[PDB]
């Protein structure tokens, strides 16, 4: 009865942007992983530190379901030890990350004839994100010697850029929905079991 609410994470009507990545917490629920096995509609499925088969018989203190959207050329950056705009400025996973990365093409849902621009991503940042960090500040990035007092212009750019998602875009630029499951096990009771 108390099955973990994975449905509302994967089958969510709408998703969030990578810089504003959404996080859901899974605790106190039997973890039925049969939805990942049966659903063959997944393009990329890579787990690190743990295996999926020996996961329905293993408990955890808590699970985190992070959700966001990127383009196909960046899906490879969703993994430990990766570098790039997404890895460095929007969503970073730790080198010792323990979980699973799933990504599927959502070109049918996150594209408009005039171009769907509602999904954004951070373009500039003075430093790289720490693991599991969410930066949502809209501060004007200072690229030059002249300080920017909240105003844009010469070497003063808005840090967020919008994706160009059209039905005719190349597969490398089509939209992809990404779900990242991370498992934690501490010196505390385990509420999530398979």
């Amino acid at each position, epitope marked *: 009865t108390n099955l973990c609410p994975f449905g509302e994470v994967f089958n969510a009507t709408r998703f969030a942007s990578v810089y504003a990545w959404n996080r859901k917490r899974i605790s106190n629920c039997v973890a039925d992983y*049969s939805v990942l*096995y049966n659903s063959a509609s997944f393009s990329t*499925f*890579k*787990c*690190y*530190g*743990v*295996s*999926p*088969t*020996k996961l329905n018989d*293993l408990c955890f203190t808590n699970v985190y379901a992070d959700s966001f959207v990127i383009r196909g050329d960046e899906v490879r950056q969703i993994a*430990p*030890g990766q570098t790039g705009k997404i890895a460095d400025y929007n969503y970073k996973l730790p*080198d*010792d990350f323990t979980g699973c990365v799933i990504a599927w093409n959502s070109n049918n849902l996150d594209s408009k004839v005039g171009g769907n621009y509602n999904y954004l991503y951070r373009l500039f940042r003075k430093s790289n994100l720490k693991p599991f960090e969410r930066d949502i500040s809209t501060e004007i990035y200072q690229a030059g010697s002249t300080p920017c007092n909240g105003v844009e212009g010469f070497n003063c750019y808005f840090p967020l850029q919008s994706y160009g998602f059209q039905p005719t875009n190349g597969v490398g630029y089509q939209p992809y929905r990404v779900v990242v499951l991370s498992f934690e096990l501490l010196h505390a009771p385990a509420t999530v079991c398979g």
Partner: antibody, heavy 121, light 109 residues
Framework: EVQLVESGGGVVQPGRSLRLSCAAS????????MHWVRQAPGKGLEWVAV????????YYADSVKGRFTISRDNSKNTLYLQMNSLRAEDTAVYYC??????????????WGQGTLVTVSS | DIQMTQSPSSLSASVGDRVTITCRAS??????LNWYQQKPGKAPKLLIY???SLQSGVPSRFSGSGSGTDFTLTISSLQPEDFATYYC??????????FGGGTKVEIKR
């Protein structure tokens, strides 16, 4: 005393299909994840496919994804590998391997002697 | 993907020598590095798992070590039945299992 016996290997034209079968003995075959690993003549080992103990999960590497299929029959204590759309790169000796399940990750406990598969016409 | 560089490509040692083989990974793997052996023609055989865990039924003279990227496999005293090709295999990339190049230990002559 754990025994794995591969069979079904032969020579086959490119684009054809073949069926490898592994027979397990002397251990609970239905309670372990099973692996297939191939080695090309003169090359090293390369991971191919994995199936869960209950036969509900099936995972493959990128080089054969959507091309090979891995299944199992617990009642008959066997592990099947259907190789459809075989290419020249697929020419190798294929082994079936038990997992062990002692860690959170995959490691290969016992190896069968393998069966040869060559792709020519 | 993850590439496993295994060195030396091929070493020469005599019986009783303290043999050591290095395996380096492109990225970080916690301790999920396993060491296998294969005689010519025969099937591979498991030696070490979880980077320093000796498998049941293996002589104690084999020992693994190392964490992160640099891993080492050591035979304290070589024996005649140990001349084979040893591979190192990472597992951290669970669904992207990769093997090293191997290090054939020849009868140094």
């Amino acid at each position: 005393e754990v025994q794995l016996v591969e069979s079904g290997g032969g020579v086959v034209q490119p684009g054809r299909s073949l069926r490898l079968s592994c027979a397990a003995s002397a251990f609970t075959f239905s309670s372990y994840d099973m692996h297939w690993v191939r080695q090309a003549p003169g090359k090293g080992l390369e991971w191919v496919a994995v199936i869960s103990y209950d036969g509900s999960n099936k995972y493959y590497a990128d080089s054969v994804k959507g091309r090979f299929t891995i299944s199992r029959d617990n009642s008959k204590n066997t592990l099947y590998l259907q190789m459809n759309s075989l290419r020249a790169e697929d020419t190798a000796v294929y082994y079936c391997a038990k997992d062990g399940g002692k860690l959170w990750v995959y490691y290969f406990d016992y190896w069968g002697q393998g069966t040869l598969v060559t792709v020519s016409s | 993907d993850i590439q496993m560089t295994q060195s030396p490509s091929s070493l020469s040692a005599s019986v009783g020598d303290r043999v050591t083989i290095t395996c380096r990974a492109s990225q970080s793997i916690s301790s999920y590095l396993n060491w296998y052996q294969q005689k010519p023609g025969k099937a591979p055989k498991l030696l070490i798992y979880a980077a320093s865990s000796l498998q049941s039924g293996v002589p104690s003279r084999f020992s693994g070590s190392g964490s992160g990227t640099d891993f080492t496999l050591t035979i304290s005293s070589l024996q005649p039945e140990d001349f084979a090709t040893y591979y190192c295999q990472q597992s951290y990339s669970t669904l992207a299992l990769t093997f090293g190049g191997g290090t054939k230990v020849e009868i140094k002559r």
